[PDB]
Enzyme design. Structure first.
Site, PDB file in Angstrom:
ATOM      1  N   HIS A  74       0.841  -1.169   0.000  1.00  7.60           N
ATOM      2  CA  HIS A  74       0.000   0.000   0.000  1.00  7.60           C
ATOM      3  C   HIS A  74       0.893   1.241   0.000  1.00  7.60           C
ATOM      4  CE1 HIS A  74       0.228  -0.728   4.401  1.00  7.60           C
ATOM      5  NE2 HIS A  74       0.115   0.588   4.484  1.00  7.60           N
ATOM      6  N   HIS A  76       1.246   3.900   2.020  1.00  5.40           N
ATOM      7  CA  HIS A  76       1.712   4.653   3.176  1.00  5.40           C
ATOM      8  C   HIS A  76       3.197   4.897   3.115  1.00  5.40           C
ATOM      9  CE1 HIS A  76      -1.853   4.162   6.201  1.00  5.40           C
ATOM     10  NE2 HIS A  76      -1.846   5.360   5.631  1.00  5.40           N
ATOM     11  N   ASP A  78       5.473   4.365   5.083  1.00  3.81           N
ATOM     12  CA  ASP A  78       6.329   3.226   5.498  1.00  3.81           C
ATOM     13  C   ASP A  78       6.372   2.033   4.548  1.00  3.81           C
ATOM     14  OD1 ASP A  78       3.710   2.143   6.170  1.00  3.81           O
ATOM     15  OD2 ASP A  78       4.229   2.077   8.259  1.00  3.81           O
ATOM     16  N   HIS A 137      -7.114  -1.624   6.070  1.00  2.00           N
ATOM     17  CA  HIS A 137      -6.153  -0.793   6.756  1.00  2.00           C
ATOM     18  C   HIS A 137      -5.999   0.548   6.007  1.00  2.00           C
ATOM     19  CE1 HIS A 137      -2.325   0.602   8.232  1.00  2.00           C
ATOM     20  NE2 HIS A 137      -1.902   0.589   6.982  1.00  2.00           N
ATOM     21  N   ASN A 168      -2.827   2.292  13.319  1.00  3.17           N
ATOM     22  CA  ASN A 168      -3.250   3.522  12.670  1.00  3.17           C
ATOM     23  C   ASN A 168      -4.517   3.321  11.809  1.00  3.17           C
ATOM     24  OD1 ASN A 168      -3.413   5.965  11.184  1.00  3.17           O
ATOM     25  ND2 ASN A 168      -1.598   5.424   9.884  1.00  3.17           N
TER      26      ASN A 168
HETATM   27 ZN   LIG Z   1      -0.224   1.636   6.339  1.00  2.00          ZN
END
Ligand SMILES: [Zn+2]
Length: 215
Positions: A74, A76, A78, A137, A168
């Site tokens: 994904h 994000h 990170d 998520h 998160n």
């Molecule tokens: Zn994430």
């Protein structure tokens, strides 16, 4: 078989002859290293450029092959954070159109945007399916399935038995997240191992846990 690096910031443990889990401390974060006859494939690189370079270097040295490909599960920071390292080294960064779009909108270099809902890749001997099961998520999260091993990289969609809450949720769809978990349970009825985005490798139970955490 846990091989840590210089610092212990990167660690890899074997799941089988050809599949290892990589984990970098950033909160540990998992991904896979796939040892194929054509190169190393990563399911997810690392939090940022620094640890992504370190990860690539550690596995290229250990396995004596080049990382050729990474699958980004994904957009994000990170997950996309080492994108710059991959693109500059000519490492193919696979992602959905949606992940790539998100990455671009968040000011990252874009991965390939080449994965569909279901995509079947083969790297040397190693078959890899990516599956977009729906939102959870994040909007864009995908899982990766190693059908020769019945191994599921759940990524951040999937919580380890240690995760006692959802982590998160700022970008999460906590209503669709159950459905998406269910879509995974339906597609892959026989799972040997699941790799959560953080924490220890489990089985089908991780997805049942994640289901529970969404209640
Ligand atoms: Zn994430």
């Amino acid at each position: 078989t846990v091989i840590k690096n210089e610092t212990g910031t990167i660690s890899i443990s074997q799941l089988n002859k050809n599949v290892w889990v990589h984990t970098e401390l950033g909160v540990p974060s998992n991904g896979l290293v796939l040892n194929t006859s054509k190169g190393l494939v990563l399911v997810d690189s690392s939090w940022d450029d620094k640890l992504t370079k370190e990860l690539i270097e550690m596995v290229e040295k250990k396995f004596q092959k080049r990382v050729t490909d990474v699958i980004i599960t994904h957009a994000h920071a990170d997950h996309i954070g080492g994108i710059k390292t991959l693109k500059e080294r000519g490492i193919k960064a696979h992602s959905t159109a949606l992940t790539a779009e998100l990455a671009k909108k968040n000011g990252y270099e874009e991965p390939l945007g080449d994965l569909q809902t279901v995509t079947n890749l083969k790297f040397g001997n190693m078959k890899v399916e990516t599956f977009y099961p729906g939102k959870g998520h994040t909007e864009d999260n995908i899982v990766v399935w190693l059908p020769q091993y019945n191994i599921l990289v759940g990524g951040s969609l999937v919580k380890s038995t240690s995760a006692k809450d959802l982590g998160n949720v700022a970008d999460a769809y906590v209503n669709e997240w159950s459905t998406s978990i269910e879509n995974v349970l339906k597609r892959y009825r026989n799972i040997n191992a699941v790799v959560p985005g953080h924490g220890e490798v489990g089985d089908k139970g991780l997805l049942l846990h994640t289901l529970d955490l969404l209640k």
